[PDB]
Amino acid sequence: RKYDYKLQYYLNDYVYAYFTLPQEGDKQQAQVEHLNSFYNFVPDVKAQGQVRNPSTLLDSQLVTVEGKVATYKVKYKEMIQHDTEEKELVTGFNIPFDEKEGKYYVSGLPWFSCIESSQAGYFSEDDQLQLTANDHVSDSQHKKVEKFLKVFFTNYTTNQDNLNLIAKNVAIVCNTTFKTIDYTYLKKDRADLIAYVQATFEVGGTTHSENFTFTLSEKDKSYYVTKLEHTIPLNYANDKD
Amino acid sequence: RKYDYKLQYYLNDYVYAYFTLPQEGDKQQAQVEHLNSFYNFVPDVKAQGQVRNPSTLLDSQLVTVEGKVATYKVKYKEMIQHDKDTEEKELVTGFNIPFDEKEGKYYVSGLPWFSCIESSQAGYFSEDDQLQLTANDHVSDSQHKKVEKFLKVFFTNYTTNQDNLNLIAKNVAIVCNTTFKTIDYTYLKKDRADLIAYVQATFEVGGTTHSENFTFTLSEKDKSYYVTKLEHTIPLNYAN
Amino acid sequence: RKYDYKLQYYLNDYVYAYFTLPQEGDKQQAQVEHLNSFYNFVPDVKAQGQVRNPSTLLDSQLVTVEGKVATYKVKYKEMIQHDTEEKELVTGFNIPFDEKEGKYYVSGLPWFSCIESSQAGYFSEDDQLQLTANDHVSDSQHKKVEKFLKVFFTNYTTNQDNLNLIAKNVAIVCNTTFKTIDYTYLKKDRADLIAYVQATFEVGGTTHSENFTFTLSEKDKSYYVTKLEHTIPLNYAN
């Protein structure tokens, strides 16, 4: 079972039924019967007479399903057309459900919640990556590395066969021009040479920087790339600890 | 591997190539070669002169993948050309695709086949499974009042202020864009030191009012209650 | 936990912030601050200055998440006004991320890649499925099978109760007329008789072929379908 969307598509239908209500009172009956068809039993509601404006579902996304609770994020619009009065709302919307013999139903009244922000904060300053150290390495080694990297970065943006000469398992990139090496700290690791590198590429008319960790093996007068990452680790200059 | 859509996007492409055929006879050639590129080898079909009208794919969704079989739900329209006019007939069906993988790459291995779209809605329910909110509890009139007085504060806070809510309840987030309106129902049940309230109440969001259900687990604190646990369902077997 | 899209929706927001830059050189500042809010710390960039044209995100899809690396496929347009030049580009776009207490952040500069083709090739010709063999099986069995399969295929397109008489656990199909059996190779396997079959169905005004493997058990004067597959195996004429 690599994929199973049956539940999700079901609840998507529920959510549409619930947040959809047209203006014409005729057609407004059928809509509610469509909605009631989702429940095992229409929920027992003591309240006398709910008020209910016409509504359109603008956007729905299932964020999680945990136990017998599905949680959506919803954006819907409430309209009275006479001239038009409108409001747009977003909310969380939580649906209690269950399964009978591979079939689904809504089991209960849904409930509203706030959409939670996903972004983390409160970061230790110890977790920041500053690219400010300098290595105490030869200018001659720096020249050799620098000369290798222009070839590498040329190949990495242009030719797969050439890249395979100087690097293991590295795919080339599309639609890109190499421009500049802007940073390079070198660290000997027994027989390997780690290069931590930031460089500059142009895609269309726009340039971006990216970071690399190269693991270099000596071959001929030059290098071979045994391993390439796309992040510089925080502990990159730990030849100093 | 938290997420992997590679297969799904692939099959999405297959399904579009299969249910798409334009009118322009020049463009209609290339479309078939595009389709044939999905298979390892174009499937062997004995029947000659298949009848293939133009069609447009209106909608496709992968519903499951099991083994080397993908199952879609499809809505497409065929453009059937008469003499006097043209017909546009709209069909939905299920559509099952046999596939395989070579070294993290994909291909369609076989002729796909059509099926009925499964209804996902359950039915034929025992009446024993319904939630009937009718009873009056065996529980004191005075407790009824104290709970009722607590719940207006709770519900006020639950819709208005996080700090206040934390005084009277553990780990309960407030709700957005909501006004409290009414408590409409309340059955109380003694559980040793705790008091379970089953509660239905009425909120206004925008210009619309909805009912919702709660199970509170209430602990005595001061002259009042503390909310140890809050659920958003009343359980079927809630009474005595 | 059947479903959890929290990460995916997060990275969708990142990708929109990154590939979006409006023309107004002032509302262009707030956009960058919106983008910077994703990272734990705004990445340290040694290169000075940098050229950034307005851009609109046309399309994004997360293809994989592996470790702390998300990989997208992206389609965006760059808008250069001087009249208007628009470049439309697709690329891969890889985002390094992490989680603190069920929350997310982008941890580093993202990087571009080629969108990998998903289609396999380089197939052995031994793996092609040709329906071209003829069985060395009696002409009388051929007739009995043929007569069964018209009933089966009629039922399979028309009536569930009838289908259950002649087959275990086979759902009928909707909106379909049976038309023709176009191929049939028969093979005894111990007690069962395997039929490999291709037939022709009409849905709307269009006809398609499909393939079946039936496992047939003798019942009465006829067959019972113990197992139905929808693919003929490569090694069928064994």
Numbering used by the authors:
A (entry chain A): 89 to 170, 173 to 331
B (entry chain C): 89 to 328
C (entry chain B): 89 to 170, 173 to 328
The paper states:
To confirm this hypothesis, we used a cysteine cross-linking approach to investigate the ability of OrfGExt to form trimers in vitro. We introduced cysteines to replace facing residues at the interface D1:D1′ (K90C-E154C and Y91C-V153C) or at the interface D1:D2′ (K134C-D272C and A204C-A264C). Notably, under nonreducing conditions, variants with double-cysteine mutations, particularly OrfGExt-A204C-A264C, assemble into high-order complexes (HOC) (>100 kDa), possibly corresponding to trimeric form (theoretical molecular weight of 93 kDa). To confirm that the trimeric complex obtained using cysteine cross-linking conserved the same structural arrangement as OrfGExt, we solved the structure of OrfGExt-A204C-A264C at 2.6-Å resolution. OrfGExt-A204C-A264C shares all the characteristics of the WT structure. Despite various measurements carried out to characterize the trimers and comparing them, we observed little adaptation to the constraints brought by the disulfide bridges and/or the change of the crystallization conditions, the overall arrangement remains unchanged, as anticipated. SEC-MALS analysis conducted on both purified proteins revealed that OrfG-A204C-A264C mainly assembles into trimers (right), in contrast to the full-length OrfG, found as monomers (left). To test the potential of OrfG to function as trimer in a biological context, a orfG knockout mutant strain producing a full-length OrfG harboring the dual cysteine substitutions (A204C and A264C) was generated and subsequently examined for the presence of multimeric complexes. Mating experiments demonstrated that the strain producing the dual cysteine mutant conjugates at frequencies comparable to that of the WT strain. In the absence of DTT, the OrfG-A204C-A2064C membrane sample displayed high molecular weight complexes including one of approximatively 130 kDa, consistent with the expected size of OrfG trimers (40 kDa × 3 = 120 kDa).
The main model of our study is OrfG, the sole VirB8-like protein of the conjugative and integrative element ICESt3 found in the Gram-positive bacterium Streptococcus thermophilus. Bioinformatic analysis using constrained consensus TOPology prediction (CCTOP) predicted that OrfG consists of a single transmembrane α helix (residues 37 to 57) followed by a large soluble domain (OrfG64–331). This soluble region comprises two NTF2-like domains OrfG64–204 and OrfG223–331 (referred to hereafter as D1 and D2, respectively). Our data confirm that VirB8-like proteins are predominantly extracellular components, assembling into a conserved pattern, which serves as a building block of the DNA translocation channel.
